[PDB]
Amino acid sequence: MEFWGIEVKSGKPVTVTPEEGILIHVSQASLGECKNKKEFVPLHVKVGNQNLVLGTLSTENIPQLFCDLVFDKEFELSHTWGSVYFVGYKTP
Amino acid sequence: MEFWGIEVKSGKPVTVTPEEGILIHVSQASLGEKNEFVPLHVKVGNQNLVLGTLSTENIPQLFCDLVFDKEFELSHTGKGSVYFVGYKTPN
Amino acid sequence: MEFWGIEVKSGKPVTVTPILIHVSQASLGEEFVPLHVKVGNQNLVLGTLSTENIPQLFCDLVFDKEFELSHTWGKGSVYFVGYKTP
Amino acid sequence: MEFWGIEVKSGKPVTVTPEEGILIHVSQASLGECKKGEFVPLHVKVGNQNLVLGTLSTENIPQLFCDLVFDKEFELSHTWGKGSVYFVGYKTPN
Amino acid sequence: MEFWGIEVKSGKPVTVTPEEGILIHVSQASLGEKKGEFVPLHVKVGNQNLVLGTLSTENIPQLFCDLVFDKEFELSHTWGKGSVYFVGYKTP
Structure with missing residues (x-):
């Protein structure tokens, strides 16, 4: 079981691919720093x-969320904002 | 243990039926796409x-630790869908 | 491991008697x-x-023995939901 | 694995002592009822x-959820004055 | 499995190095002991x-998390008028 995390920028989706036999557990999603906040x-x-x-x-109200997400297969993360960081761990 | 999720449309209850041996764990419920309860x-x-x-304004999603061993129906009510997401795993 | 849930009505405390009962959340149906x-x-x-701000809460509660749940809303119930497991 | 919980009164810190080989898992902390805005x-x-x-x-954050594990003796405390804080969880080996 | 926690002071980022065999699980981050600020x-x-x-300070004094660290990591914050406590447990 080992640390995992990625920074997703606005626009084109980031494709993550677990190696066969490994799960990617996503524990949270958190906004990066914005200096002109007002946005969903x-x-x-x-x-x-x-x-x-x-x-x-x-921004201001919900800067992050906590989650219990499991990915056994390939998946694409995306948003249209700044970046969003997805953090968790890998495990068999 | 594998990814599970559904999109539930308004006033249109979805019946989920775990296959024999399998649990459906629901981890969260989130509103779809911004412009009330x-x-x-x-x-x-x-x-x-x-x-x-x-x-809509304050609570766009909630986090949960729900286990379903048998058939269940999810539902809501008006101008969108609610996504329920989690994973399947054996008993 | 199997689904568990109860509806607790106002002024009507429910006694639950276990297996472990894991309570995962409490949610209003239909002020503090x-x-x-x-x-x-x-x-x-x-x-x-x-009612307006905190309609539910999330929890990781384990009950190995008998317990009684209750509230004093009056104008609704509180649903407690989770699972049973050995 | 068995139920655990304590009521901590204001200015009365509670010392909890796991027996050797047992963990105390704290799952949450919740305010009792008082009567205004007070952190x-x-x-x-x-x-x-x-x-x-x-x-x-008092008004906005009556409780919090947590995943805290205590293997050794620990003391919980708060400074509210007009109430108690309940800490709830379970005991388990290892 | 045993208690773990650190106090991170402002402008003093802490480098944590898990002992051989062990994972550090971080369960939460909480502000110490005014002002409204992020x-x-x-x-x-x-x-x-x-x-x-x-x-x-006013709205989000703490957050809950499920973070696992198998290797060395550095925690840091930018408050200036206090510390942030990171708390969890160690486990093999």
């Missing part, structure tokens, strides 16, 4: 044929 | 229970 | 609402819900 | 360390 | 600098 940030994931919304972050 | 309902057996209430 | 539990000679407060 | 820092002492577990608030 | 939480691990969340 939907978090999108694509997994197989499914396109889902993981949550909506907000 | 959304009770989340579940029906396991005859128990029509309330899982929480989302709110 | 203290949640009370009685376990093993102790009477404790599990949290306070609020 | 409530939660303190713990473990060995030579004095740490802050969080700050509760 | 406090980004930073971690450095390997080649990565990531943001764990943003605390706020």
Whole structure:
């Protein structure tokens, strides 16, 4: 079981691919630093044929969210904001 | 243990049925896409229970640790969908 | 490991008797609402819900023995939801 | 694995002592009822360390959720004055 | 499995090095003991600098997390008028 984390910028999706036999557990999503805050940030994931919304972050009110997400297969994270950091751990 | 998720549309209850041997763990409920109160309902057996209430401005999502071993129906009410996300795992 | 949940009505305390009962959350149905539990000679407060701001709370509570859940809302119920496991 | 909980009164710090081989897991801290706006820092002492577990608030933050494990003796405390703070969780081996 | 916790003072980022065999699980970050202001939480691990969340004096005094560190990492914050306590447990 080992640390995992990625920085997702605005726009094109970041594709993450667990090696066969490994799970990526995502524990949280947190906004990066913005110096002109006012704004809402939907978090999108694509997994197989499914396109889902993981949550909506907000400057000032909802800078991060906590989660218990497991990815066994390839997945794409995306948003349209600044960056969003997704952090967790890998495990078999 | 593998990814699970559904998009539930308004007034249109989705029935989820775990395959024999498998648990569905629900980790969260999140509003879809911004411009006022959304009770989340579940029906396991005859128990029509309330899982929480989302709110457009303040409570766009909630986090949870819910396990379903048997069939269940998720539902809400008006101008969007609620995504329920988690994972499946054996018993 | 199997689904567990109860509806606690106002002024009608529910006694639950276990297997472990894991409570994962408390949610208002339908101002402030203290949640009370009685376990093993102790009477404790599990949290306070609020109609406009705090409709639910999340928790990691384990009950190995008998316990009683209660609240004093009057104009609704509080749903406690989780799972049973050995 | 079995239920654990304490009521900590204001200015009366409670010392909890796990028997050797047992862990005390604290899952949450919740304000009791008072009567206005008052912040409530939660303190713990473990060995030579004095740490802050969080700050509760009467109107906005009546409780907090946590995943805290104590293998050794520890002291919980707060300075509210007009109430108690309940700490709840479970005991388990290892 | 045993208690772990640190006090990170302002402008003094702490480098944590898990003892051989052990993972450090961080369960939460909490502001110490006015003013309304924001406090980004930073971690450095390997080649990565990531943001764990943003605390706020009036609204968000603490946050809850499920973070696992298998290797050396540095925790840091930018408050200036206090410390941030990171608390959790060590486990093999």
